[PDB]
Amino acid sequence: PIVQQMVHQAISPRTLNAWVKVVEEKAFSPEVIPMFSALSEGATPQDLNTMLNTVGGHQAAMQMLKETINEEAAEWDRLHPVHAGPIAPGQMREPRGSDIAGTTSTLQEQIGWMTHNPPIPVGEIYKRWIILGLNKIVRMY
Amino acid sequence: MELSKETNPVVFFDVCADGEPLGRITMELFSNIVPRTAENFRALCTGEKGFGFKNSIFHRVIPDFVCQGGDITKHDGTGGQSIYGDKFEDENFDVKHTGPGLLSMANQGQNTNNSQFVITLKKAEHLDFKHVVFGFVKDGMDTVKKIESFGSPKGSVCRRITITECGQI
C-alpha cells in the first residue's frame, strides 16, 4: 500500500492472513465487506489482487467477482474515452478500466496515479468495484 | 536546421482564435527522413483525399510543451484519421525532439498514428522513441506562441483555435 511523504510498501503477510481468515471462517457473511475495507487502507490495485488471489478455493465466487470487475472496468471505459498523447512532463497517461483493475498497468503506474497532484485514486476506484462484487455474492445467499 | 531540403514539401496553416486572425504557420516536412508520415500530413493539408485539416482545431495546448491539433473526426483528442487508415505504424524515430517548432505525431501508443499532431514549444526528449518527428516550423513561430498563450497546464484552451485555411505552397 501507499503510506504517508507518500511512499510505497509491499502488502503485509499479516494483512493477507487476516483476509484469508475472514474469507475462510465467515464466508458469505456481510462482515467480509467491512473487513475488506479495514484491511485495504491505501492499497494499490496490485495489493487488492494479491489479497483476492491468496484465497484458495471459492473459484465460482471469484468468477462472479471477476465478472463484476469486468463490467465496472467496461463502464469506466464507456465514461472515460482515451485521449491521444504525448504525455507532458510530470504527468500520467489516462488509466483504462484494465489499468484500474491492475491487469494492464505496472506497479509504478499505479503508484504514479495514486500519488500524483492531483491524484487518480485507482486503488479506491477498484475497491468500489470489488465491494460491489462482494455484495452480489452475499446478496444471493 | 541541417535536415532541411529545397525539395521537401512545404505546407501552411492559417490560424484564427474565435475569428481573430493569428497569422500563418509555414512548415517543411521531412520527406527525406520520413516520407510516409510526411505524405500523410501533406495530403491532409491539401485535402486532396476528400478530408483534411481544414476547419480542424487545436483542442489541447500545454504551454512550454505542445500545441496539439489534427483530430479531424472528433475534434477533442479521441479521434483522427490518416490517408492510410485510422492507424498506421511508427515509421522511424530518427529525428529527435531537440527544441521548439518541431512537428511530431500524436498517438495512443505503438503504431497508432493518424492525423493528430503536435507543434513543440520546447525540447522534449521524453517523447523520443515514442513519437515520430516529421517536420519543423519554417516561419510563423510567432503564431505558434499566440496559440500557446491560450493554453493551460492540463491542456484546456480558453479560445476556439481553428485552422481556417491550409494547403501546400
Residue numbers in the entry:
A (entry chain D): 1 to 4, 9 to 145
B (entry chain A): -4 to 164
The article reads:
The cyclophilin domain from human NUP358 (NUP358Cyp) shares only 65% amino acid sequence identity with CypA. To determine how NUP358Cyp binds HIV-1 we solved the X-ray crystal structure of HIV-1 CAN in complex with NUP358Cyp at 1.95 Å resolution (see Additional file 1 for data collection and refinement statistics). As observed for the recently published structure of uncomplexed NUP358Cyp, despite the sequence variation between CypA and NUP358Cyp, the structures of the two cyclophilins are remarkably similar (Cα atoms show an r.m.s.d of 0.5 Å). The slot-like binding site found in CypA is preserved in NUP358Cyp and the complex of HIV-1 CAN with NUP358Cyp has a similar quaternary arrangement to the CypA complex. The CypA-binding loop of HIV-1 CAN projects down into NUP358Cyp and mediates almost all direct interactions. In comparison to CypA, NUP358Cyp has residues with bulkier side-chains at the capsid interface, such as K117 and D59 (A117 and G59 in CypA), resulting in a more extended active site surface. This is reflected in a larger buried surface area in the NUP358Cyp:HIV-1 CAN complex (610 Å) compared to CypA:HIV-1 CAN (420 Å). For instance, the carbonyl of I91 in CAN makes an important hydrogen bond interaction with CypA via the pyrrole ring of W121 and with NUP358Cyp via the imidazole side chain of H121. An important hydrogen bond interaction in both NUP358Cyp and CypA occurs between the side-chain of CAN H87 and the peptide oxygen of residue 71 in the cyclophilins. Analysis of the HIV-1 CAN:NUP358Cyp structure reveals that residue 61 is located at the center of the binding site, almost directly under CAN P90. The conservation of R55 positioning and its proximity to CAN P90 suggested to us that R55 may hydrogen bond with the peptide oxygen of P90 and lower the activation energy for cis-trans prolyl isomerization.
Recent studies have shown that the nuclear pore protein NUP358 contains a C-terminal cyclophilin domain (NUP358Cyp) that interacts with the capsid of HIV-1. The lentiviral capsid protein differs from its gammaretrovirus counterpart in that it has an extra loop between helices 4 and 5 of its N-terminal domain (CAN), called the CypA-binding loop. The cyclophilin A-binding loop is so-called because it is the site of interaction with the cellular isomerase, cyclophilin A (CypA). NUP358 is a large, multidomain protein that forms the cytoplasmic filaments of the vertebrate nuclear pore complex.
